Amino acid sequence: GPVWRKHYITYRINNYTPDMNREDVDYAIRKAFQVWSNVTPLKFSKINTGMADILVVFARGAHGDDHAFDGKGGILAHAFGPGSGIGGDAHFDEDEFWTTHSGGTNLFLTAVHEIGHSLGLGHSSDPKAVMFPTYKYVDINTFRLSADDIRGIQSLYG
Ligand SMILES: COc1ccc(S(=O)(=O)NCC(=O)NO)cc1
Ligand SMILES: [Ca+2]
Ligand SMILES: [Ca+2]
Ligand SMILES: [Ca+2]
Ligand SMILES: [Zn+2]
Ligand SMILES: [Zn+2]
């Protein structure tokens, strides 16, 4: 399906979870974009105003799309593939407790997966892939994409 047909992509953080320090939210999301820019020709820039390609949102329950959140647990986040408007946007369930670490739900690891969707990736059947639909914490300091993730993204870009 859809892919971004340009190399410079913008994102904007619509609002901030009260679960984390603001700078930690910024850094998690930045690091998650870097995972993908490492392996494609894409460049990502955070903008503070205006229409971004990728809007990052924290919201709970019904929040104006067809993908209502479900309280703590279950669905952690969802994202829309490349396109105009809501296309590219990544939404994180505020009913989760977002963290920089192994506690609650790790924002960085979740964001890597969601941004994969924002770039056009679907799910992987390989438990080793970040694009596998089940959340499982792994050490974020040594995190690496699986070969399956890299194959998937390189099928769309570069
Ligand atoms: C590692 O990243 C994620 C992100 C979300 C989920 S999930 O919310 O539990 N499943 C729905 C989903 O795949 N959303 O993109 C599971 C893992
Ligand atoms: Ca949930
Ligand atoms: Ca968008
Ligand atoms: Ca929360
Ligand atoms: Zn949503
Ligand atoms: Zn997913």
CATH fold type? Collagenase (Catalytic Domain)
Order of the strands making up the biggest sheet? 2-1-3-5-4
**Total E-strand runs:** 7
CATH superfamily: Collagenase (Catalytic Domain)
| Share of β-strand residues | 15-25%
Shape: globular
Terminal-residue CA separation? 16 Å
Q: Tell me the structural class.
A: alpha/beta
Order of helices and strands: EHEEEEEEHH
Helix content: 10-25%
Described by strand count, sense and barrel closure, the largest sheet is: 5 strands, mixed
**Number of helices, where a helix is a run of at least 4 consecutive DSSP H or I residues:** 3
In the CATH classification, which architecture applies? 3-Layer(aba) Sandwich
Total discrete domains: 1
CATH class category? Alpha Beta
CA-based gyration radius = 14 Å
**What ligands can be seen in this structure?**
N-hydroxy-N~2~-[(4-methoxyphenyl)sulfonyl]glycinamide, calcium ion, zinc ion
Structural write-up:
This protein has three helices and seven strands; from the N terminus they run βαββββββαα. By secondary structure, the protein is an alpha/beta fold. The strands form two sheets. A five-stranded mixed β-sheet has the order 2-1-3-5-4, with helices on one face. Strands 6-7 form a two-stranded parallel ribbon. α1 links the parallel β1 and β2. α1 crosses α2. The site of N-hydroxy-N~2~-[(4-methoxyphenyl)sulfonyl]glycinamide has 14 residues, from β4 and α2. One zinc ion binds next to loops. It is found in: Secreted, Extracellular space, Extracellular matrix.
